């Protein structure tokens, strides 16, 4: 009854847009999910993944996880990642690793920032004004994998891959009225309010026992029409290698994230915190100056090193004894809006752990909270007027083979009940300047906010 | 055995110290400063003790001061940041505000090539996460200052008779120069 054998695989026509082509006809279904590498030219832009029609769903709201299978619903207050691992284990699908098919079915979806409240005792100052799950994960016994390295489109299934192929080709992409913003963007904070929150952070930093805090503002507007049309345009313009579109029961998540959180590939762990940003400049030779300036900036190196030390600690607690390395420090990665400073930490997952345990031990990311992490999260709850919900959580997959990949949901929009939300923050340290840090939030999402204005 | 006991004082970076010691091939037991008694240490028979950094004072660091009092001269002890200040306090030293608060900043330190600095380059760039230093004027006679900042703050101390040493910086920060060899000096010494 335990299924150890590889899934059945059919190869389809190679086309670069294969994921967007097939997902268009699925984009309206709850639990249809796309992981898209943004067509990015990038060391970690290789795969697009498409799933839909899960065999099981997990929805966490606060203390309660609902597990739904075709005709059985269970509610539990257990650790949501323990519940996820139990649901994966009970599917009895246990394939070997395959470097060309890193997801062989398993869990895929959203780990909201507020899921972090299940792993750490935090106060409840910030307002819960978005009703979207802390965890929304499907269990899929099939996937469509677009491999931009081998130029292969693979359909795998542990059931009946021919029927799944027939099911996919039988779905048709309906017209669908175009996306339009129906208001202007408004922040949840004035300049003055940002100022007050920034000063209160630096007051906590000067008193020690906080080193860094990620402070964010949130833009809100009303919208009408198909979220998928918005995604196609944002995806084209953002070219972000950890992009995703999740159709949930409660709304839509449009992720244009350039940030990998944690990869677990055949038990090799990798995390790539982004800490350090400068806007891109129109003149190409001035822009090369910006790139070298970010790489050589003492303020952003210090901000980054602190997050590298924090991520080494969180991974190191659960990594194989002696396996933690930092093969790359302070590399500059260009994206359409911004240059980012990226560091890379590697480790080995012990045989006794699951990728799900690694995610619990590190979630949410050091790079979007601060150091010490629990104190940073307390400050963020105190000063940010609303909970982050899906923003600065993670999207990704936990394969039946044991592999995992996750993003940080920076540059991510939440579309719910004709409202769209887009947040932007930055690390605040002792040496940060009020005005520059405020301006940095706009530099991060201005191209996103402006592209949606029509 | 060769077991190293790392007393965890609830630092953000204590598992970096654990991982550096595992990289050097040590057998390390980690215990929180309030999950351990002196009687327990006696039964475990560590070859050496490391007292980790942490966001509290030496008085608030659970058994940390008691371990220095009971095991000084009996087992080698290394104090890191809070552990270094606890070491100073236990012998009559005083801890005071540093010139500038330092949170993930690198500074060059000059050493005398003694204790954990045996065989290491001079100067050495190290990562600092601290707002307090050991007051130079009130440093017990039993300690040599093994390392100074550019502004003449204590960055390291060694007991003159016993294998008992403090560093004010994080040797296990990825930008702390020769962090591995410094801790190897303590391990293999
Ligand atoms: N870029 C990843 C796949 C991916 C795209 N978007 C994602 C979002 C989350 C996790 C993974 C992804 C890869 O090439 O393997
Ligand atoms: Cl809980
Ligand atoms: Cl608002
Ligand atoms: Cl940043
Ligand atoms: Cl951001
Ligand atoms: Cl001297
Ligand atoms: Mg910055
Ligand atoms: Mg198991």
Residue numbers in the entry:
A (entry chain DDD): 0 to 453
B (entry chain AAA): -1 to 187
Q: Anything the authors wrote about it?
A:
Here, we chose aminodeoxychorismate synthase (ADCS) from Escherichia coli, which consists of a class I glutaminase subunit (PabA) and a synthase subunit (PabB), to investigate the mechanism of glutaminase catalysis regulation and its impact on overall GAT activity. PabB catalyzes the amination of chorismate (Cho) to 4-amino-4-deoxy-chorismate, which is a committed step in folic acid biosynthesis. GATs comprise minimally a glutaminase that produces ammonia, which reacts with a synthase-bound substrate to yield specific nitrogen-containing products. As evidenced by analytical gel filtration and isothermal titration calorimetry (ITC) data, the PabA and PabB subunits form a heterodimeric assembly with a dissociation constant KD = 0.16 ± 0.06 μM.
Finally, in all ADCS complex structures without Zn2+, we found a second well-defined and structurally conserved water molecule in the glutaminase active site. It is located approximately midway between the imidazole side-chain groups of aH128 and aH168, suggesting that it critically contributes to the establishment of a catalytically competent conformation of the ADCS glutaminase active site. The associated changes are most visibly illustrated by a long-range movement of residue bE119 from the PabB subunit, which is 10−13 Å from any PabA residues in different ADCS structures devoid of Gln-TE in the glutaminase active site.
